[PDB]
From Swiss-Prot, chains A, F:
Upper classification of the organism: Bacteria, Pseudomonadati, Pseudomonadota, Gammaproteobacteria, Enterobacterales
Function per UniProt: Catalyzes the pyruvoyl-dependent decarboxylation of aspartate to produce beta-alanine.
Cofactor binding, note field: Binds 1 pyruvoyl group covalently per subunit.
Post-translational modification: Is synthesized initially as an inactive proenzyme, which is activated by self-cleavage at a specific serine bond to produce a beta-subunit with a hydroxyl group at its C-terminus and an alpha-subunit with a pyruvoyl group at its N-terminus.
The family this protein is said to belong to: Belongs to the PanD family.
Name of the protein: Aspartate 1-decarboxylase
This protein's record includes keyword Lyase: yes
Residues of the full protein shown: 25 to 123 of 126
Organism name: Escherichia coli (strain K12)
Modification sites for Pyruvic acid (Ser): 1
Example of a GO MF term: aspartate 1-decarboxylase activity
Keywords linked to the UniProt accession: Autocatalytic cleavage, Cytoplasm, Decarboxylase, Lyase, Pantothenate biosynthesis, Pyruvate, Schiff base, Zymogen
UniProtKB/Swiss-Prot annotation, chains B, E:
Top-level division of the source organism's lineage: Bacteria
Interval of the full protein contained in this chain: 1 to 24 of 126
Transmembrane segments: none
Name the UniProt record assigns to this protein: Aspartate 1-decarboxylase beta chain
Signal peptide start-end: none
Protein species of origin: Escherichia coli (strain K12)
Swiss-Prot record, chains D, H:
Species the sequence originates in: Escherichia coli (strain K12)
Taxonomic lineage of the native organism: Bacteria, Pseudomonadati, Pseudomonadota, Gammaproteobacteria, Enterobacterales
UniProt-recorded name of the protein: Aspartate 1-decarboxylase beta chain
Length: 99, 27, 92, 25, 27, 99, 92, 25
């Protein structure tokens, strides 16, 4: 499982107990688990259980959730995207972020 | 009814850093 | 396939023939198969077929199932979790 | 109309007791 | 409405042998 | 993709163009692709495209399809299972089959 | 993520933000990501983020999307397939 | 009520033209 600061879950629209994909930019590993809420404002991203074989402290990851919907909705759907930098500082747009 | 259903990105955390790893987690 | 003591399926809400994810805490491997019922009380967890390449006797694993539902219901959904230790002794 | 995939349940830290590559069933 | 939906094994071919492999398949 | 004798698809209830999982008993590889119908009575199982990196002629595989349904149906659902031996000879039950 | 010439998305019925499977004919790797639109006519196929670990420039890949529908409709369903050769030249 | 997962479409044998590990978007 992956414990995630509740503020981050809210920004990405991800629910506690929702299925998530984690794609490890650092090492290339890809794995699917579920979300666990960590305390709001903790800025925690914690890989728990077997998932700890797939990421290490300091790894840069992308955490995604997927939903299903009919085609017409899909065609106008806008994902909830949160961008990070630094000490897991959240931003609304990619335009803020260093190299 | 019988509508075709797509799997779509709902949202993501882009380039968040892992802060902790716990192989032995009880939860 | 993975055969699992029916007591354990009952506690976790996992159904015979349901899709299951298996996450191997010992060796890190992750795979998806389906659940088979094993005799009630046997405490069995048996990896069968090609899945025998992904886990060995004595490996510690997490076995999960997923369901879909609308967002409104998902917000309050509560998963069925069973905790184990020792020789597949449930309730701690 | 947006459908979520949610953890239904889990068996946490069970031990593999048997492996049977040649299983028929 | 709002019913919980399971993913279930529909059917399988058990221990069928692979007869051909075609990396360069056009189809 | 995996081309499969149409008689085998009928027995397992698998549709042309349906998603399938293939679990390689021989080498342990696991992969997801889709079904392609091969000529009825050909007894073909052909791994095509990138899937040819995951299985070889002579490998023993399990080919599965999954469907979704509400819980109550799920609780009484019976999968369509076909068992093989020899020259991809299909049987209805496992009780026929050599070691 | 995988950015893909919008012409190609149009031919295959793949939508921006849709889940996609990528099967690497060159190296055998298989992974799942989502589609991003690239400029129409560019012939781009760009692997971004962690997916850059799974494919190199010049690798040949198959990019697929899946949908669900009831069994009655699935029986006659017809997928949208686009064929390519050379330098991402569509229609052969 | 039994819902099938079906190939929607595919791009067959396209070539990767670019790789961008550091992509932001």
């Amino acid at each position: 499982x992956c414990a995630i600061d509740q503020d981050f879950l809210d920004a990405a629209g991800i629910l506690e107990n929702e299925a998530i994909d984690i794609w490890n930019v650092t090492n290339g590993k890809r794995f699917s688990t579920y979300a666990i809420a960590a305390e709001r404002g903790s800025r925690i991203i914690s890989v728990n259980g077997a998932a700890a074989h797939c990421a290490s402290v300091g790894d840069i990851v992308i955490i995604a959730s997927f939903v299903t919907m009919p085609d017409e909705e899909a065609r106008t759907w806008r994902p909830n995207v949160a961008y990070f930098e630094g000490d897991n500082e959240m931003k609304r747009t990619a335009k803020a972020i260093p190299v | 009814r019988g509508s075709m259903i797509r799997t779509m990105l709902q949202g993501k955390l882009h380039r968040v850093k892992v802060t902790h790893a716990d192989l032995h987690y009880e939860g």
